[PDB]
Symmetry: C2
Subunit: 523 residues, 2 copies
Amino acid sequence: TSDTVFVRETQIPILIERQDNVLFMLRLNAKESRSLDEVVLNFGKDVNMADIQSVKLYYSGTEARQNYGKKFFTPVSYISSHTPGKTLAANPSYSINKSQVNNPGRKVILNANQKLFPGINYFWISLQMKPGASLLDKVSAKIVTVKVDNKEALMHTVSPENIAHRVGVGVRHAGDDGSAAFRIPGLATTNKGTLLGVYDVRYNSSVDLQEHVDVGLSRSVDGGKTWEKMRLPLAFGETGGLPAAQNGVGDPSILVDTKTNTTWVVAAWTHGMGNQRAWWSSYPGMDMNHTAQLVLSKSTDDGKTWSEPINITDQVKDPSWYFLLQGPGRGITMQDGTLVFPIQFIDSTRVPNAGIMYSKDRGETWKIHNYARTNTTEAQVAEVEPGVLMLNMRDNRGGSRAVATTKDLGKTWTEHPSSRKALQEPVCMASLISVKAADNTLNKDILLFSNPNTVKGRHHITIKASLDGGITWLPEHQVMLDEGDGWGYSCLTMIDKETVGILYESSVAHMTFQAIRLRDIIQ
Amino acid sequence: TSDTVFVRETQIPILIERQDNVLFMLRLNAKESRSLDEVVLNFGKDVNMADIQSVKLYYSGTEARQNYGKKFFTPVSYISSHTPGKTLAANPSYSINKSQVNNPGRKVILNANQKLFPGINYFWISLQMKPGASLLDKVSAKIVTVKVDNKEALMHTVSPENIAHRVGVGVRHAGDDGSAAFRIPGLATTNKGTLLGVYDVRYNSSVDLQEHVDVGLSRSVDGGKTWEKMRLPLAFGETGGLPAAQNGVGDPSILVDTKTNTTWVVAAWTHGMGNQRAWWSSYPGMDMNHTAQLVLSKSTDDGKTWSEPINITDQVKDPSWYFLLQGPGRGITMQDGTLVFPIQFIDSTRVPNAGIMYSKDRGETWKIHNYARTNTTEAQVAEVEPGVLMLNMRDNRGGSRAVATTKDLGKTWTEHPSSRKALQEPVCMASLISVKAADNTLNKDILLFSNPNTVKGRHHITIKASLDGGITWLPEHQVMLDEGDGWGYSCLTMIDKETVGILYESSVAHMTFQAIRLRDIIQ
Ligand SMILES: [K+]
Ligand SMILES: [K+]
């Protein structure tokens, strides 16, 4: 009986700056087959071939005998998203480049000429884009033929038809600017159309506070196609005479004041605490020697320069709380001009609760009333209707987002019908934004939500849209961006009236940016 | 305990090439204390000050409040032995240099001028040697006084008196020559006095075979003071057309044929097996497509150049075995000229057993008879009496080395009285060598043994000596080299008649070499 070539097409971001991106994985258990001669690939008729730099065929060897029958399509991860300075190209010890076509036409014949191991053989196709490719590029392709021993082999494709591969930008890769890792994205759009992406700069490792951590900022003036040199809006160094690794600041949240175009970044500055996690090393009290400090930096020049830190802890923290901080990601300006950041606090019973913090005087003073729900942490807030705030919350009970609304800035809360039902989660950060009819090309109020669409692990990062104020999230109104494993956090914004932007922790880069046409999500 | 300065002196190798080495750790829980001002350090009168470049005082901040009762002396590891390119100097985000004295005299005055955190404060003293320091350098020192608020503070020292700090050489540091890690040391001395140290070059990570692994070799012609550029006696690259990471070779063992000065390195070449562990991926058979290959490289020019691989699997592997490989470390030449390497094999029931393979014809042919003991793995062999081989084995039953002897090259074995009693272990590689009276300065037959002297974890690397063929290992005949945590493998050799050499995985470098006067061990 003939050997079958199994094909799995990927559904992960193709990074424009990467030298390799995994497009297809092939697996052949060679019982009769002696040689794989060539693979024939055909790109879709609508693909812009001028944006493609190269297509490559790699051989990645065999599998351990105990793993036969587990349906793996690779023996190992081919391209690192963690090794500093080694995240742009395939690890050459794992994959052998058999052939490559630079500036291909729509039909590509990739010469393998690979004698097969008597057993499982892994191959894959790498796609490399030109550095200037459009972020709205979609790539589709089919493997048409695989020639084995000078005959067309039987094929079986396990992945779905009509995959649209999307490109992206790795705004931050592991190792960039001397930092081991980047985590915890926030993203907003200024009134000038400028994109501001913030994140933790985790210099020593990927671990959470306490550690040597700054808040970094990447600024783009061309819709996310290019990003300016990293800025550091918040950084505490050797403040108070303690080492820099005992002065981390992180979990940033960004908002743009739409009335003035002033941008605010809020984060948690942790002082002391040895090398332990702030989540259980911040204690009751008010000063830096006991408890995490809530600090702001503002920019009045469209994100180019940033103020010294403004410590607002004494305005909003109850002394008996262990830890008050922002919900990472972004905040909002309400229609009436109120600025709002989601927040979370570990109360005096050591239980975390989400809520909101607001300012009615353009960020000069801030107020918190009551929590929305017990035993919740990271949350994002959206003005779903004028004067009605919806808080969408990470819930420690597991499995699904909690949702509540308030009409009085968090004095009182009402459980939403979608709560603990509509949006499954693995207990992870999620992004929520509201986009009003006046501001988007669909002329409909929409909610957009992003998270790992799973209840276990962090994978299948998905943007979901709701047309009925978050009551329903229809399957047809969703785009799955990244099937791979990552750290899972994401943040949304509108790039313009027709286009969604997302900054997130992906399987391919610590900070990944993608642009998605709104009409691709809601067709 | 408040306002007492607690002191812990380290017992770890001082690497000659490091810019920092941790010599003392200080902890002060400051209740009444406001500033730590001045620390006075006095080196022992026998210390060679000309070999010391500088002494530094670092402040490393505070501790998490939940750990105040745990009696730690640091908040974090100060100097990495794992981060590529960053293993030579204190991480400056963890430690602030408050004071430094270059070209010190015997009495050193360090001025901290450090305002104290209201709570735990950590300080430490760094010792930096001059590049040409002697390997037999011993350094002793005492903290004489610590001034807090311009008064001499109460001091309490928790570490023992009369610590002799030894220097060492980091033959390989994580990241050297493009390799993430180095593991599994072997060490021998040629008839010319040349030191040959071998190890795994684990390019991608510290993970065991299968992976991209070569056998590396460092050669020293000056007693271990300096080491020549790394050689690669065994490396298989893309053999058979598989990726380099499916062609690893490792767990080397080295022996010098004392009759001819030819040096032999034996290692296990694993071909295929995906990215899984060879221990569970090698299967019965003889071909490279099924089972690990036992390969040799020889040097007939005092270790300078190495033959192409010699595959001896067919001579010594039983087809029914899952896996045959050498015991890592070294082999020997018996008095009568027989070459012997320890080995281990996973038999058809998938149980490992240690034994020996030998050659009576200068390495042309090799033979294995019977295992010494079931459910044993890594072992080292020594000729404890003429014609009597002692095999000292890692025993999966836990807690202690197994020991057996054979008078017929492994046809029959006798359990030694010391077996499973005399030498505790955490189930780890251990080194054993025999040194005849005529070959050392004491004119006594001795055995030397090194391992992590513990039943839990890999730390307290210790050299032990025996005068009665391993029946007794007296406490006074031991030197503890490294109290820190590491990967635990070690290998001994005689540098010359007066001096022991050890190459090992230490808490300060992946491949650490130290030279120890024999009379320091058996006084
Ligand atoms: K509109
Ligand atoms: K052979």
